[PDB]
Ligand binder design. Structure first.
Ligand code: A1AEP
Ligand code: A1AEP
Lengths: 312, 312
């Protein structure tokens, strides 16, 4: 049904997807409406998609040409099960199962658009960004291999490996370098700035010719310690994890606005008074998470006129 | 003794100081040597100083015209006592005592150079940066008040209030807005990028005419859970706090390098195999912390030739 076709212009259209546990049902609600407004799969209209943690799941599926409805079905099938886990080993196994089943043996040579999948290096404590094409590399292009030769499953699993509650994910690059990786949300749970870095620096696009759409997971009432103590034994570490991720997400958006006022950007992550959920790490109740789909469609509707102007 | 005088050029010299508990003895070791190499108090040569958490203590004293030896004496007198606290209430009281005793009733109208003191808004989860002069504001300059009318004590206490282990610090701005603030290290424990944002965007300085010096606290062997379990009851939250702060520090440096390759910058935060310490929150043993002073002087000596070229 997504038969609408678009001409080519010199405008770089960038999509940046936040991480947020199983609450990306909100993200998919926003994306569904953007898809139906365009009349084409998202990879045809967007030049670059960045994602972090469970947002990298969506970003990778978009880059492989999936339609949002297909993404929603896979996301429903696998993401809540990961978050329902209540042991580190169960969480890591659930996540490994998701990665292989969803992405199989696809690689970063298989993508149909620019991509960036953000993880965090345990050793250097700096990001490792799996990319698809050398033209968005900022250096060392003689040794560039798409995705470091790593499969999309391993890159997405790394992006999601929120140690200490998941195991760290060990990777060996095509150049023969072994790296231990953890969740990308520690350095850029909101990956918009990173995506902009590719567009401005690596793709040499002028700020006038960039359109950025950054979709989050939405903002909901924070779980209080009384609830957290009943479901998590390390409740304070669980709360600290959530609060720090939120700060990283919001402060990253403020920094983008400070440094890149002249880059047209729409961020979609509205505040709601329901549902009352656990943290991103722990929430898996599909009855609550499915209502985030509607909330995402509501957030699109509040911005549809400007989104039409961005994406044409 | 600091009698050397320097002419005026159009080069913006920027100093950016990481947070790191009581381990800023390392920072002061680096700064002592920079001071003695210059022959003047740091505020005469530097145009802008940014600091976060215990690094904002040093940055504020530099901005008030203190000499590094004076800063070291105050830092020794008050910072380790804060970190020796083993209850939230004891920590918050120790920190309040430090703020008032060290800075008394000085305000952001009392500074002798540009300053930025970074804290984190609990509500918006975005930075609140206390500044001294409207010319480094990026907007809303009609309502600008130096430091929001807040005293340096309250701004530095806010920058250091690492909730959940300190209480959040309540502030009322000169415009009559009340804000709850926590440690700046949650959004920019390394404040170099923020400082660069002021120099490039707000001060309209060309990248060629900026010199950035970013001093950290150094990198040391990480405490393992066996040790942490013996000194902290919420040891996993304590470890997560340290690891996330480190990632914020190092990833912030990587992002600066990606976005601002053409801004001359020196970062000084070397790796050492001793001393073995607790996390930044918990370490207070002066016998260990005092050896960081020597390590900071060693780190300066490895970069003295290039530091001479930066600062003349
Ligand atoms: N848009 C951005 N926003 C914020 N930070 C960014 C961004 N881009 C890079 N970085 C950081 O800068 C460091 C060096 O980047 P370089 O581009 O200069 O060199 C690249 C490239 O040549 C090659 N390579 C990259 C991707 C791939 O799929 N295959 C592959 O071969 O490896 C190096 C990447 O390694 P890391 O990713 O581990 O480290 C990066 C990252 O920490
Ligand atoms: N260099 C930077 N790097 C990264 N982020 C930055 C930087 N600078 C600002 N921001 C962020 O951008 C938001 C809006 O900044 P604006 O400069 O546009 O307006 C300012 C100013 O007009 C006025 N004001 C500022 C300081 C002072 O001592 N008295 C005073 O009156 O208040 C607003 C500040 O409030 P916050 O600090 O709470 O929010 C900031 C911050 O989140």
């Amino acid at each position: 049904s997504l038969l609408t076709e678009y001409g080519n212009d010199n405008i770089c259209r960038v999509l940046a997807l936040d991480g947020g546990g199983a609450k990306g049902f909100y993200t998919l609600g926003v994306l569904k409406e953007i898809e139906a407004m365009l009349g084409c799969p998202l990879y045809k209209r967007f030049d670059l998609v960045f994602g972090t943690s469970t947002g990298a799941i969506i970003a990778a599926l978009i880059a492989l040409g999936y339609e949002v409805d297909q993404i929603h079905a896979l996301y429903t099938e696998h993401v809540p099960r990961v978050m329902s886990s209540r042991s580190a080993a169960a969480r890591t196994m659930a996540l490994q199962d998701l990665a292989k089943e969803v992405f199989q043996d696809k690689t970063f040579e298989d993508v149909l658009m620019g991509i960036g999948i953000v993880a965090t290096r345990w050793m250097t404590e700096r990001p490792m960004i799996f990319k698809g094409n050398v033209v968005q590399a900022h250096g060392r292009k003689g040794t560039f291999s798409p995705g470091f030769g790593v499969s999309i499953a391993d890159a997405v699993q790394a992006s999601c490996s929120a140690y200490p509650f998941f195991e760290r994910k060990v990777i060996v690059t095509a150049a023969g370098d072994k790296v231990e990786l953890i969740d990308g949300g520690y350095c850029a749970n909101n990956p918009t700035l990173f995506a902009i870095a590719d567009a401005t620096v690596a793709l040499k696009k002028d700020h006038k010719d960039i359109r950025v759409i950054n979709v989050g997971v939405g903002i909901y009432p924070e779980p209080k310690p009384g609830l957290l103590m009943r479901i998590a034994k390390k409740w304070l570490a669980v709360q600290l994890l959530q609060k720090t991720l939120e700060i990283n997400t919001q402060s990253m958006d403020q920094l983008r606005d400070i440094l890149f006022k002249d880059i047209p950007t729409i961020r979609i992550s509205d505040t709601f008074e329901r549902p009352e959920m656990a943290t991103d790490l722990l929430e898996y109740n599909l009855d609550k998470l499915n209502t985030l789909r509607q909330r995402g469609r509501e957030s699109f509707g509040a911005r549809e006129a400007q989104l039409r102007e961005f994406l044409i």
